[model samples]
Target: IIRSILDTDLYKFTTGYAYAKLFPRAYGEFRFIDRNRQGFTEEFAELVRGEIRAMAALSLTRDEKEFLQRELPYLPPIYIDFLDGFRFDPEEVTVSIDAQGHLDIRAQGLLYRVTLWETPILAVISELYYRFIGAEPDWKQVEEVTRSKGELMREHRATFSIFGMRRRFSLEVEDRVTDILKQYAGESLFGTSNVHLAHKHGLRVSGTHPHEWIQFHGAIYGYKMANYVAMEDWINVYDGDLGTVLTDTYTTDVFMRNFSKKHAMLFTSLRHDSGDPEIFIEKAVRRYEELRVDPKIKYIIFSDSLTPQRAIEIQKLCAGRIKASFGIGTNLTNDVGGGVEPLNIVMKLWKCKMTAKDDWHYCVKLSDVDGKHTGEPEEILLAMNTLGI
Candidate 1:
């Protein structure tokens, strides 16, 4: 709350105003709660200090600290009291060791048994939950839920492993690498052609129109290319001429309004390059539908530099009424210098001079920092564990 209030002046000012308004009339003297209860112990401070020191030593960032601080006030009071309860009687939580050198911790009838080797894997799972899902869900609760639905979780884990792994190359060397990937993967990982290679290779081709597309003709020529593209194949057209519109591109909404009259049935939806796409799409789709055109063509595709979170929010707002896609170009393609680019290369090299008796030691440069401290793996595994029956 403090960080958010500090980050935005509007929040500070509005919240301040609300507080003042709510407390316009002071009714009585202020009161305070005392922690002088007989059961309150001083040793709890030591545990609290240890927890804070551990967090600080780990180099927790300001954001992480602020998030934890904000959540501290809302945590159930039992959380803190439980630790005190444990301190009073340590054996309330039992610790045991098995003959095979395994450690077990049992607390409140819950048993957790583990070997030293499995500790690292448990730590990884805890860290992954904290990072990916935030601190909302209880780690214990997640384990309980997964255990209750073990079969479903196993199915989901299996499904998650299947996906595409093609890499995008600089346009300068795209053709060369395309040929190589095609030769080895035999069109399974690459496409046979270059124009729509990404799409042909099971990746979506992403792009948006230039402002020149609408401004070249000074006068609005409605339904010009819509009919043309639809004739070949029902094309997914988006009109991005809304905002400046090349000094007159603001006529995009106007063009779309008129274009829908001729090829309204073929129009998938309009594209809003500027302004609130959600609001503009809602308004544009309504205008097109009011003209006796099918309301099914109310979808809007937005091609702005929206972040992943914002894109998901927009998808939720559309709620199946319309579809959207992102066209990421400038963000991905502006890294090459002097138009000269490196061709995609995947080679296996020896880490050290090979002896006549041993196999060649294979290696590759993992990353570069001033071309120093190249990463080296201590070991590599290449095996096909499939034993044919």
Candidate 2:
């Protein structure tokens, strides 16, 4: 089902454009992390490999590029031209499944090209897994839950987007969910993360940076200064078009430390992906005031395992001060009530090289949550100590 390159999240393109120009010569390695148990077979693994190779054939049609160009003016024509001619290099990815049915995937190549593999790989794995090994999802309940959430969102006046591409049950399910939300949530719905869905549903594609951007910067620059440089580099590329900075890549505290007055003024909002939202909000408001920026003018996007009620709660908290929105993923797409649970999976960049001549460097990411940190054990420890986390 993963045919169109546009089926991936909007951030893939946003970051891809920046990587193509800013880190063109950089090499990257991405590894899969399955957060829970799942069953797979050799047969299933073989099918996944085939699907991955088929993904190589995906490229933007002239019409699709025109559509994207219109939707994302910040992407510019050069990146659109690149997408028009781009193809996934299957040589960059490797896939295998264990005898007990454990799945493993890794992608390594030029960061600009290899980075595109993450979303499609996880999506393909998820879609195929549900199709081959999972129990039947409660379609009626799923649709009902989706509509109910949209209704609650409308009633709460919460702004949100569907961000479930990497872990959605299937393409059709997410498409259906988006349609339902668009109908019920109406103006309260902002967009969906998947560019293709955004195009099909006539909704905006929503995203900015992911952890990889800051992780690469941590590896290239100094870890202590990653958030600052990452923010600076991003604004340099987009010129403030995508200004909501993700603040938990190396802990929101460190991010706030680097997000001094200059950076604070440039980025329009902050994203709290881990830790306590209230504390993050209060801290964000405090930091803005410390920088002499008004908290009400800025906003916070709570994208961490959020439910509609949680979003409503945060919305209430931000009512008098900072603005608040949400980017809900599994809750929206995979919440088909049943014994079947959504797969917890992620692909993260772990290695970086500025050029072939330079030595490979391991990347590290420290979210606000301890268990959520991903990196070499020793480096993770070092970052924790060095940053006083």
Candidate 3:
């Protein structure tokens, strides 16, 4: 069972806080993308509904509130207060399955509230699939694989974190994976993005902001100036604490143009969520150099479906040039055997409104990966035109 709202990745709270403060009345809709076309049964759909209903009943406990206030001092008081009263609405999510065994899910509500559904919904869908498919993970094999990964990271002297919530095979498996990482890879395991697992194991929580933060801003401010405004607003909010900016929301090229000298100095790190890791490192390092900033001081978080081998490769490439870390997600969590191919799925914000009465604007993300952008076709074209991409 998902224990608490904190079970989600830290970015939810980080970006949720920004949305709460800047676009409180904004309504957004998110649609699920099953890139693999992996189908689900009707029973799985009903189970998801039940899981969502249960999640809706969950609330922020006193201890959890205290934890947020203490750990994330950068969060504004009003956003913290909003969390105090925040609760997921079951009505916001609609789930169904077609006769052909395809799952259809959509979440629609205020930006801050609906944004919370991504992790939980993905978790439910994944766990339900594995449960019904009768794919029991080989823990002994998992341990062996994880231990080797830990040793590899240790050999490379890399800083890494587990970021496998959405794509984890099951909650139980994720717990075991975290336990193994802590037990065997403590030296290199920087932390976990999953807040619940991080607190349970007494580990550091790792995350800054996500692509949605930029996409939402792009929707409101146009893609050309959105990254700049987002960086400015984020700096205003966190000052310097959560300073790792996610590049590739509108392609790393566009992001670099906006990541001027002030932003380069202000942010301690840059996160690469899509495209080639090596190229991203080169670009980040070159930008820092061009700005006359110390690239060695700036961290590069390589989080694009990295394996231990890939992390080591990137580590070697960036050894003396810049501080590098990795955030491993699916490979860490959903790498179960039994021939179960993990779902390549994502739920992204498609449309948002600035106010209740304002006309809705479609949010588009032009990721570094080709043909992976989300939102309506017209809006995507509009974003392309605005960004000159």
Candidate 4:
């Protein structure tokens, strides 16, 4: 699943504020997608149309009615004649209400999936609250703590780099790296050791082993059993590397093909890090099925922008052949830094250096140049407030 924090441009914020002032407790519709990949058939569309028409006719405010009449010429006709329905309230208000209300909207929008957006959103809220209330709110503080904890999870999360020693690490380097990892896993980045760190912060450090251990040590000394012991000790999420084998160095699929046959029960899931992930995952699942292994073993595909829609597409394409989760990196943690959302905050200088103020000259970009003026700023505002397109 992909997570996203609900954010809008400054224009939307201003417009939403205006809309709320006009109609307190109003509801709006935030249309995340303009089209549903042709999933909405004509019949289904008609049914939705009827419902919306009935709703609009029931309790639409004067402004809403005017908007439908003068501005949204298409909305009323579609609802009244073609669909025989209207919305219970204005779609604009509905969108706004649900955008803030829905728990999963963040995930839907990929905001929660990105650590940068998440931290910034929280920080913005915190700053706003501190400014207005003269102190931070308890809930906001809770959110801050939660996000801080996420930092730990974010740091430990790793993608299986499969480009070999150059890309990954040599066995000797891997051991040293693993030692460093174990230190951090059992302690904070700045902490010296697990126990010392735990005592100082009232927290515990943890980590897990990988399938590479099995490959390096082989199964002669009960590699699987030893790795299992290490995993249990570290409290690491099973499939720590986001997959079982690093496909770049050796044939991960080939290993999995036999590995699953021998240890299906222990194979909680596999991780895929390299190549065309969406396609490779599908192929891997198919191969797994051919081997007659239970499809219960989930596939945790790791990547940067593997959105919820993409995940859904993967599941649909698999046709119940596979189940999966995601471990996103890069764009999520490194790119998403803590800050106020860089909302589409655009300001155009309306006046240049005039006689009254000759110190600093100001100029607005050509209004008509390249159709930049957007004669329909108000219309765009409505679209943003009502539809969130």
Q: Which lDDT values do the candidates have, in the order given?
A: 0.28, 0.86, 0.84, 0.30
Q: Give lDDT: candidate 1, residue 78.
A: 39
Superior by TM-score: candidate 2 or candidate 4: 2
TM-score of each: 0.30, 0.97, 0.95, 0.28
Writing each residue's lDDT as its tens digit, candidate 4 over 1-389 gives 00111111111212222222322232211222221121223443333334333433433334434433443232224332211222223222111113323211121111111111222222232233223334322334323433443344335432221111111111222223333323343322221112212222332211112222222112112222323332332223223221233332123443443443544444556555455566666656666677776665555544324432344454455455665444332211111223422112111111111122233221111111123322135532432243222
lDDT of 3 by residue, 290-325 (tens): 999999998988888889888888888898899888
Give RMSD (Å) of candidate 1 vs. truth: 29.2
**Candidate 4 TM-score over all chains jointly:** 0.28
Backbone clash count for every predicted candidate, in the order shown: 1, 0, 0, 38
For this target, which candidate reaches the highest lDDT against the unseen true structure?
Answer: 2
Pairwise lDDT winner, candidates 1 and 4: 4
| Candidate numbers, best lDDT first, in rank order | 2, 3, 4, 1
Displacement of residue 349 (Cα, Å) in model 3 is 0.5
Best TM-score among the predictions, by candidate number: 2
Tens-place lDDT digits, model 1, residues 200-272: 2332222222232222111112223322332222122112211111111323343444454555554444555
